[PDB]
Amino acid sequence: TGEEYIAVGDFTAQQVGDLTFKKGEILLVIEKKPDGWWIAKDAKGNEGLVPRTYLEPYSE
């Protein structure tokens, strides 16, 4: 149900859809960059809109 990257940027959600992650945490990704965003998940349970741009793959 997605692949996991970690964010390496500190983004917050300003609109609905997006999530709030920090510069070096682990996220999951679910959908591919239509316009820049994928639908990701965090280590809380929720899922948002995070870009790929500041996402790096992880070593599970």
Curated annotation (Swiss-Prot):
What does the record say about tissue specificity? Widespread expression, with highest levels in pituitary gland, spinal cord, thyroid gland, testis, skeletal muscle, lymph node and trachea. Weakly expressed in heart, kidney and pancreas. Expressed in nasal epithelial cells (at protein level). Expressed in the renal collecting duct (at protein level).
Q: Where is the SH3 domain?
A: 1-60
The PTM entry states:
Phosphorylation by CK2 is required for the interaction with PACS1 and the targeting to the base region of cilia.
Q: Where in the cell is it found?
A: Cell junction; Cell junction, Adherens junction; Cell projection, Cilium; Cytoplasm, Cytoskeleton, Cilium axoneme
Pathology linked to this chain's protein: Nephronophthisis 1: An autosomal recessive inherited disease characterized by anemia, polyuria, polydipsia, isosthenuria and death in uremia. Symmetrical destruction of the kidneys involving both tubules and glomeruli occurs. The underlying pathology is a chronic tubulo-interstitial nephropathy with characteristic tubular basement membrane thickening and medullary cyst formation. Associations with extrarenal symptoms, especially ocular lesions, are frequent. The age at death ranges from about 4 to 15 years. Senior-Loken syndrome 1: A renal-retinal disorder characterized by progressive wasting of the filtering unit of the kidney (nephronophthisis), with or without medullary cystic renal disease, and progressive eye disease. Typically this disorder becomes apparent during the first year of life.
Subunit structure comment from the entry: Interacts with BCAR1, PTK2B/PYK2 and tensin. Interacts with INVS and NPHP3. Interacts with PACS1; the interaction is dependent on NPHP1 phosphorylation by CK2. Interacts with KIF7. Interacts with AHI1 and TNK2. Interacts with NPHP4 in a complex containing NPHP1, NPHP4 and RPGRIP1L. Interacts with IQCB1; the interaction likely requires additional interactors. Interacts with ANKS3. Interacts with SPATA7. Interacts with FLNA.
Q: What function does the entry list?
A: Together with BCAR1 it may play a role in the control of epithelial cell polarity. Involved in the organization of apical junctions in kidney cells together with NPHP4 and RPGRIP1L/NPHP8. Does not seem to be strictly required for ciliogenesis. Seems to help to recruit PTK2B/PYK2 to cell matrix adhesions, thereby initiating phosphorylation of PTK2B/PYK2 and PTK2B/PYK2-dependent signaling. May play a role in the regulation of intraflagellar transport (IFT) during cilia assembly. Required for normal retina development.
Let me see what the UniProt entry remarks about domains.
The SH3 domain mediates the stable interaction with Cas.
Additional info?
A: Nephronophthisis type 1 patients deficient for NPHP1 show normal overall integrity of respiratory cilia.
Membership in a protein family: Belongs to the nephrocystin-1 family.
The protein, known as? Nephrocystin-1
* Organism listed in the record: Homo sapiens (Human)
Native organism taxonomy: Eukaryota, Metazoa, Chordata, Craniata, Vertebrata
- Tell me the name of the encoding gene: NPHP1
Portion held of the full protein: 153 to 212 of 732
